[PDB]
């Protein structure tokens, strides 16, 4: 048969071979029409039925076929495809509607917005006979203003001069180079060089695009998807002005505010994907103890049966019909991977170490699965609590990671509870302390259905917010802090747990990119942020990178090392101080990890106290210079310097071969963290940088 889907697979940054490009066809511009066949074909044509004119296009093959209409007429039409199979059948497709759109400056909708930066007659509305699909409007920016926000960004702090968008996506590595993110938000601050700021927030969970004075040097062009249903269009844009802090506080009053968190999150977090037995985990924690490199949290990713992510690997149990297990349901073989998971967790607690288990918001449907995971899958579908296609059947994951997996519907209390009830015994009976809530970026499709009544145009970006929320609520209901550790999010994510910057190679550019990610994330109210120090993917980082990154990571909100799955191949890829020391032949890295973990522990009361202040003030912890020094033009030339709380100015060393490093100190008296040497502000200062030093300066208080 012939397959044609007007929007295609709806990969946000890519197009399939069976769609219209553009997906919302535009009168005047060109229209590319693709379709696929399930068997081989010698020929295919596209018939287009306008009122008085018929046209037939000989499509060219890329089993994909394609043609294009160079200048699209402004009339409603219909189209269908005719293919000739190699065996001589003529196949014919369904009938499809073509309703070309145009931009009009007529008051089709209303943009509800205050403040004097809105351009009164900039609104353009993309309209057809089907309705109103997108709006395009503008805000003016002045020659001394800088733009920071749009969530976690990996390319640069100041977004002025760039074209970007805000859609949840998984960009596997090089997020900076590709200009994408796991955690965007349709919000930004605009900060001038006299200390005053304004901000804006497009109140939607639909996709938004921004041209931040790239095309028009004094205009921020905003484009907003109005969505599948296409209803009289009203777009609400919240706005604030005052100090940079007033503006971020504005947004948090709407979006949500960070939670209180227990002090144990500020110790070193140990992680490695190939710690996949109880003995591998304990071997590493005993090594931490014996080396004097204290760890406060261990993350176990490869803990489960790798089918349902609810049961420890090799656990034995009576089969359930998909209802939740309790802890006494399980017997653990002595010679299995996890002989006594409750015993591991108890012992680790007795040592002061908390345990976190990886989770994914996907239910595998491989044909390899055992009976328990199939039953768990059928029970999820049977509950109704599954994201659905327009036809009502379950959404099958369109990615190549976990292909065709189901996606639990976490849009309602009942669906979140259904999903997390399967995991409750882990918290209540085995006593885990939290979850690495990975993923959430898998929902592609404008026309998907959620139980809250949203379609995919609004629900898909909202998914990771609901997802982190789900597990937080599980943990609260079990008497524990909502320590979730997530990589994706949206407006609302501020209130739900901790965040890390995702997947990167072990490179200097990724180190730089990660700093930028933490600062930008802080600037949109993601307070509890971390990253995989020195990178998690590929060969172990070179010694110099690990040294510089470990140092930097000591002065960031969440400090952890992690390593990617590598099939248990050789050499070992752990980012442990000892493995990186052995692979690099630099035994000194173990001492250095001792040194900086001692600094980390001494830093913990400051991290606790400054976090508490951040909750009241609204200011980030990992804090861009403009929050306290926006009246100093010179801060913008040093965008990878940042404040850690009110008192410390941090400047990581991000270049190999560096023996000195230069820092810009803002106005005031400053004190070298390591030597006590006093410098006066308003000046550049230079520091020797042995690997035991990262430039850090403390404000000099009154005597
Ligand atoms: O064993 C659990 C799980 O491990 C790997 O995935 C973990 C990986 O997922 C994302 O990429 C995160 O961003 C990383 O930090 C994590 O290490 C395997 O790929 C997966 O198949 C397996 O189920
Ligand atoms: Ca049972
Ligand atoms: Ca005790
Ligand atoms: Ca198979």
The oligomerization state is: monomer
Structural class, please? alpha+beta
The share of residues in helices is: 10-25%
What molecules are bound to this protein? a molecule of 2 linked components (GLC-GLC), calcium ion
Cα-atom radius of gyration? 27 Å
Question: How would a textbook summarize the main sheet?
Answer: 8 strands, parallel
Strand composition percent: 15-25%
Q: Count the domains.
A: 4
Terminal Cα span: 83 Å
Number of strands: 37
General shape: globular
Strand order of the largest sheet: 25-24-23-22-29-28-27-26
Report the CATH C-level class of the largest domain: Alpha Beta
Q: In the CATH hierarchy, what is the architecture of the largest domain at level 2?
A: Alpha-Beta Barrel
Determine the CATH superfamily of the largest domain.
Answer: Glycosidases
Tell me the number of helical segments per DSSP (H or I, 4 or more residues long): 13
What is CATH's topology name of the largest domain?
TIM Barrel
PDB class: sugar binding protein
Keywords: hydrolase, Structural Genomics, Center for Structural Genomics of Infectious Diseases, csgid, sugar binding protein
Assembly: monomeric
Entry title: Cycloalternan-degrading enzyme from Trueperella pyogenes in complex with isomaltose
């Amino acid at each position: 048969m012939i397959t044609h889907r007007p929007r295609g697979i709806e990969h946000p940054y890519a197009r399939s071979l069976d769609q219209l490009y553009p997906a919302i066809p535009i009168a005047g511009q060109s229209l590319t029409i693709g379709a696929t066949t399930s068997g081989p074909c010698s020929r295919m044509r596209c018939f287009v039925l306008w009122p008085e004119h018929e046209q037939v296009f000989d499509m060219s093959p890329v089993n994909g076929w394609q043609t294009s209409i160079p200048h699209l007429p402004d009339q409603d039409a219909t189209y269908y495809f005719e293919a000739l199979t190699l065996d001589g059948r003529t196949e014919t497709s369904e009938s499809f509607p073509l309703t070309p759109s145009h931009w009009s400056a007529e008051p089709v909708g209303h943009i509800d917005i205050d403040g004097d930066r809105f351009i009164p007659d900039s609104p353009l509305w993309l309209v057809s006979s089907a309705g109103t699909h997108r709006v395009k409007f503008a805000l003016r920016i002045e020659g001394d203003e800088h733009v920071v926000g749009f969530g976690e960004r990996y390319d640069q702090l100041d977004q002025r001069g760039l074209r970007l968008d805000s859609v949840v996506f998984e960009q596997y590595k090089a997020q900076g180079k590709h200009h994408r993110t796991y955690l965007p938000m349709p919000f930004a601050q605009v900060v001038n060089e006299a200390g005053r700021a304004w901000g804006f927030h497009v109140e939607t969970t639909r996709r938004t695009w921004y041209d931040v004075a790239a095309t028009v040097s004094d205009r921020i062009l905003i484009e907003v998807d109005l969505g599948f249903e296409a209803k009289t269009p009203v777009v609400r844009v919240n706005t604030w002005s005052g100090s940079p802090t007033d503006v971020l506080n504005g947004f948090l009053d709407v979006a949500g505010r960070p939670a209180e968190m227990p002090e144990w999150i500020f110790g070193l977090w140990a992680s490695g994907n190939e710690w996949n037995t109880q003995s591998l985990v304990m071997e590493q924690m005993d090594r931490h103890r014996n080396e004097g490199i204290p760890v406060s949290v261990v993350v176990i990713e490869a803990w489960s049966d790798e089918e349902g992510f609810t049961i420890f690997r090799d656990a034995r149990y009576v089969p359930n019909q998909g209802q939740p297990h309790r802890g006494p349901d399980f017997t653990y073989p002595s010679d299995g991977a996890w002989p006594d998971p409750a015993g591991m967790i108890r012992e680790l607690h007795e040592r002061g170490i908390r345990v976190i288990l990886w989770q994914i918001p996907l239910q595998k449907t491989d044909d390899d699965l055992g009976p328990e995971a199939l039953a768990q899958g059928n029970a999820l579908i049977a509950s109704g609590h599954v994201v659905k296609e327009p036809d009502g059947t379950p959404y099958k994951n369109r990615g190549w990671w976990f292909p065709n997996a189901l996606m639990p519907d976490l849009s309602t209390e009942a669906g979140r509870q259904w999903w997390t009830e399967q995991r409750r015994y882990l918290v209540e009976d085995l006593d885990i302390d939290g979850f690495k809530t990975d993923g959430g970026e898998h929902a592609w499709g404008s026309d998907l259905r959620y139980e809250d009544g949203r379609r995919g145009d609004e629900g898909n970006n909202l998914y990771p917010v609901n997802y982190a929320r789900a597990y937080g609520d599980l943990l609260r209901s079990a008497g524990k802090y909502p320590v979730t550790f997530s990589r994706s999010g949206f407006t609302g994510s501020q209130a739900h747990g901790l965040y890390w910057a995702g997947d990167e190679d072990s490179t200097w550019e990724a180190f730089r990119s990660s700093i930028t990610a933490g600062i930008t994330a802080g600037a949109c109210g993601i307070l509890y942020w971390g990253w995989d120090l020195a990178g998690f993917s590929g060969p172990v980082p070179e010694a110099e990178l690990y040294a510089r990154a470990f140092a930097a990571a000591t002065f960031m909100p969440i400090m952890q090392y992690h390593s990617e799955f590598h099939h248990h191949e050789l050499p070992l890829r752990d980012r442990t101080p000892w493995n990186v020391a052995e692979q690099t032949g630099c035994g000194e890295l173990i001492d250095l990890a001792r040194h900086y973990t001692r600094v980390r522990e001494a830093l913990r009361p400051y991290l606790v106290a400054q976090t508490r202040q951040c909750l009241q003030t609204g200011k980030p912890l990992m804090r861009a210079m403009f929050y306290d020094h926006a009246d100093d033009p010179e801060i913008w030339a040093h965008p990878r310097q940042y404040m850690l709380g009110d008192e410390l100015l941090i400047n990581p060393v991000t270049a190999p071969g560096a023996t000195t490093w230069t820092t810009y100190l803002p106005e005031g008296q400053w004190e070298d963290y390591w030597s006590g040497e006093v410098s006066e502000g308003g000046h550049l200062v230079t520091r020797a940088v042995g690997w035991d030093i990262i430039p850090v300066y403390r404000r000099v208080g009154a005597a």
